[PDB]
Structure 1
Amino acid sequence: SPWRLLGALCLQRPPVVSKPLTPLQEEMASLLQQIEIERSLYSDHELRALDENQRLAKKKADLAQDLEDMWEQKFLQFKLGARITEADEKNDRTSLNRKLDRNLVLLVREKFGDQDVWILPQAEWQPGETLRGTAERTLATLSENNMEAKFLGNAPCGHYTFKFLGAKVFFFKALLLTGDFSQAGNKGHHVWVTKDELGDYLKPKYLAQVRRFVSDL
């Protein structure tokens, strides 16, 4: 049987920004700070605050506020880099900073003749090619950039085989270390997706079942 030999990849972005907390984790974190204070053992910062104003009361009867005030105003000096470049953009699907707290997945339109399918990015392999090397060749081919990704092993992650000439489709999983993703406004249709638009952009059974090996968290 003539097998239409197809390799692919599922690209991952690790979130540089941590996730926000649950409100139950808020009450638990506040509780752990209270009970953490309750079992501490005479920090010198309060020894330079509590007994010092006692001794000043003894001197007046016969600076920690400046340190806290300088720390407060210097806390007001450096503004934080905002964790949300996510709702202001809201349509920069091609951009790598679409989300910061979740994982982001590369996802590319392909126009065929018998089909016209929005596909998790593929490649075509040769029996001489290594499958890991098929995915390595898949990296710097379709995006046309200078990224830096990272694989883990020659183990695959998700396999789906469709016919109409036999075929098979192999899904690996890579991981972006860094990216010199030059000219992000490409003519290609790469779209970064958290989890939820993968069930929006990808309807069929060979594509509505990718999320069961996407690291959902």
Structure 2
Amino acid sequence: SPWRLLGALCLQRPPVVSKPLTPLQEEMASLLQQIEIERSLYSDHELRALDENQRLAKKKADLAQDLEDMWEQKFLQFKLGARITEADEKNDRTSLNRKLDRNLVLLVREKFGDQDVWILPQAEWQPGETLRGTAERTLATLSENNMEAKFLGNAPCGHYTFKFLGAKVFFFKALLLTGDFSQAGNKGHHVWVTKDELGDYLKPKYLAQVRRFVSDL
């Protein structure tokens, strides 16, 4: 009973920035803030304004404004980080700083002899070794950089079966911490792809069953 030994290596990248906010959530936050204001009582700023103005009026008939003005000036002078990062490029799709709001999956294009499709970076395992060890070895060899792929568990994800001699595919995921990719100008077609782009790039059924267990958000 011959069985060809293959595998798979799907990359998991945590998002940096949050998803955009909807108007209904804005109205909900506004009403929650109004409820918080109506429920709050005896605050430091409220007193430091009210009793200070009362003392001013009392000693005039016989702080706070300058402080908030300085606060507004310091807020206007300090410019926060520009969140506009997915629209100023629109060309460097294989960059780490491309998408920072959702999850990104990495895949490499490889043209074989009988097959000419865009398969996820597989991982060949040997009977003399384990499975996760061979998977992480293949992930380290196909990445040619210094990365920290923290696996979320020894259990797999999804398996398939294709014959012509039997074969099998073992999917493995790992959480990525920092991104120290060396030499981003390699000839390998490793592009950071998210969710909609992933569903649009694939074509056969062997890849259509991958978007069912990935974090769709």
Which category of TM-score, normalised to the shorter sequence, fits these structures? Answer: over 0.9
**Any gaps of 5 or more consecutive residues in structure 2?**
none
Shift of 1:128: 2.1
Secondary structure class of the residue paired with 1:117: coil
Partners of 1:186 and 1:160 lie apart in 2 by: 30
> Partners of 1:107 and 1:82 in 2: how far apart?
29
Does residue 86 of structure 2 align to residue 86 of structure 1? yes
Unaligned runs of 5+ in 1: none
Cα distance in 1 for partners of 2:94, 2:9 equals: 18
In the superposition, relative to structure 1, how do residues 9 and 76 fare at CA in structure 2: closer, same or farther (>3 Å)?
same
Query: By how many angstroms is 1:135 displaced?
Result: 1.8
In structure 2, C-alpha distance between the alignment counterparts of 1:17 and 1:137, rounded to whole Å: 31
Counterparts of 1:23 and 1:6, CA distance in 2:
48
Tell me the SS of whatever aligns to 1:106: strand
Cα distance between partner residues in 2 of 1:172 and 1:16: 23
Q: How many percent of aligned residue pairs carry the same amino acid?
A: 100
In the superposition, the TM-score normalised over structure 1's length comes to 0.95
Runs of 4+ that moved beyond 6 A: none
Q: CA deviation at 1:159?
A: 0.9
> Residues 72 and 216 (structure 1 numbering): CA distance in 2 closer, same or farther, change over 3 Å?
same
CA contact (8 A) 1:161 1:167 kept: yes
Q: How far apart in 2 are the matches of 1:102 and 1:161?
A: 30
Figure out how many residues of one structure are paired with residues of the other and give that number: 217
Tell me how far 1:185 sits from its aligned partner: 2.1
Q: Superposition RMSD on alpha carbons, in Å? A: 1.2
Q: 1:146·1:181 contact (CA, 8 Å) conserved in 2?
A: yes
Indicate conservation of the 8 Å contact 1:8/1:121, yes or no: yes
After superposition, what is the alpha-carbon deviation per residue over 1:115-162, rounded to whole angstroms, capped at 9, x for unaligned?
A: 111122212111122221122112211121111121011101111121
- 1:137-190 per-residue CA deviation (whole Å, 9 max, x = no partner) reads 122111211111210111011111212211001111111011211112221111
Residues 125 and 135 in structure 2, CA contact (< 8 A), matched pair in contact too: no
Indicate if the aligned counterparts of 1:83 and 1:100 stay in contact, CA closer than 8 A: no
- SS, match of residue 126 in structure 1: coil
Equivalence for 1:8: 8
Q: Name the TM-score, length of structure 2 as normaliser.
A: 0.95
